[PDB]
Paper text:
The hyperthermophilic endocellulase, EGPh (glycosyl hydrolase family 5) from Pyrococcus horikoshii possesses 4 cysteine residues forming 2 disulfide bonds, as identified by structural analysis. The crystal structure of hyperthermophilic beta-1,4 endocellulases (EGPh, glycosyl hydrolase family 5, T opt = 100 °C) from the archaeon Pyrococcus horikoshii, that was isolated from an oceanic hydrothermal volcanic vent, has been determined. The crystal structure of EGPh revealed 4 Cys residues (C106, C159, C372, and C412) forming 2 disulfide bonds. The disulfide bonding of C106 and C159 forms at the end of the loop associated with the substrate-binding active site cleft.
To investigate a role of the disulfide bond in the activity and stability of the enzyme, we prepared 3 mutants of EGPh; P74C, C106S, and P74C/C106S, in which we removed the disulfide bond or changed the disulfide-bonding pattern. The mutant P74C/C106S possesses 2 Cys residues at the region and is expected to form a disulfide bond (C74–C159) structurally similar to that of EGAc (C34–C120). Moreover, as expected, the P74C/C106S mutation possesses an identical disulfide bond (C74–C159) conserved in EGAc. The crystal structural analysis of EGPh mutants revealed that a new disulfide bond at the position of P74 is formed in P74C and P74C/C106S. No significant change in the enzymatic activity at 80 °C was observed between the mutants and the wild type (data not shown), suggesting that the region involving the disulfide bond did not significantly influence substrate-binding or catalysis. All of the mutants showed a dramatic decrease in residual activity after heat treatment compared with the wild type. The wild type enzyme was thermally unfolded at 103.4 °C. The melting temperature of the 3 mutants was approximately 101.5 °C. These results indicate that the alternative new disulfide-bonding pattern involved in the position of P74 did not contribute to its hyperthermostability. However, the thermal analysis indicates that the C106–C159 bond with higher potential energy contributes to thermostability while the C74–C159 bond has no role in stability.
Numbering used by the authors: 34 to 410
Write the structure that this text describes.
Amino acid sequence: QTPTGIYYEVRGDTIYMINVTSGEETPIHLFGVNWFGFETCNHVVHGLWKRNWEDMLLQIKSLGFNAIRLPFCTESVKPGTQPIGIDYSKNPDLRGLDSLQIMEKIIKKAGDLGIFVLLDYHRIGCTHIEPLWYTEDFSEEDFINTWIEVAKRFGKYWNVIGADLKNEPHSVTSPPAAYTDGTGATWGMGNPATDWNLAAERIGKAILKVAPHWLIFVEGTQFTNPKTDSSYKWGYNAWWGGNLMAVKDYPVNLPKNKLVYSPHVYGPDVYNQPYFGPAKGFPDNLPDIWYHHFGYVKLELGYSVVIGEFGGKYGHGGDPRDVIWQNKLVDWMIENKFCDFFYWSWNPDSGDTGGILQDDWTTIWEDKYNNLKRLMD
């Protein structure tokens, strides 16, 4: 049942941590941030050219976060891959460590701070988010075998809560071709080769065999199937990893107590959606849009829903509407008890969103953080 003595499960729409020996159960909330870099060709979380890695973890904790989503790529979790771009004067205890060793060191230190870790298979290779969980040179079997290896190793760390199976399933063409051309993810189309709802079951089953105590986080797609997507006026305008409209009629076939749906959602800094125009009702139109794309998965169906990525520049060198957008989203999350989330990102080096840290990798954006802090109390 568990190699750590700790077992994670969902009961209703809440995540619990169970100590299997004592029988003690505690509901947990995830007040999270994404710290990315292991999925990039740096092969290590970013910022270690400017900061000490432990200081970073301490700072994250000091802000009241208790969870980190950690993107990785295939090579970052294999022995022998060397990190690039670390200032070893500020990080002397990382000298001579490969990427995998640094990942273990970070997760252990997070655990010491009571910080939960969600592992996110973010890129197959270190360059770009593929739309599917396989490529020409890298098969679904390869992808699954990588998850198995990761689950066996990291399943031993008590604070690792589970697996975000694939970052942002999406499409690289427009409907109608996106549903049939084999280049992008679908949901409820019926073809198990492209249907993310079916692949997630296959990948999830394999992971739970070796890490039965983990949770399986399943993101949305961009498009699902034409019947579902056409059933709503903004059906073709969901984010990558953000379309959960097909969950109702095409649920992922995995145990209810292990499954967490994990939509991504973004504001005008990422894309100028038509619905961000005051002409189309911005921002009072937003709750119904969020509700349709993903919110109903919790509010109507009662699944656990954890927002896996959301963020924006909050008016710092971006679209000023982003301030209104992030405020409205936080208001809505509070009102509707979406208490579990991972903000994108801790890193400032995200082109279209910036992060919680400013470009100096040291000082935070006080206003952006103050808004976020409302979710943590």
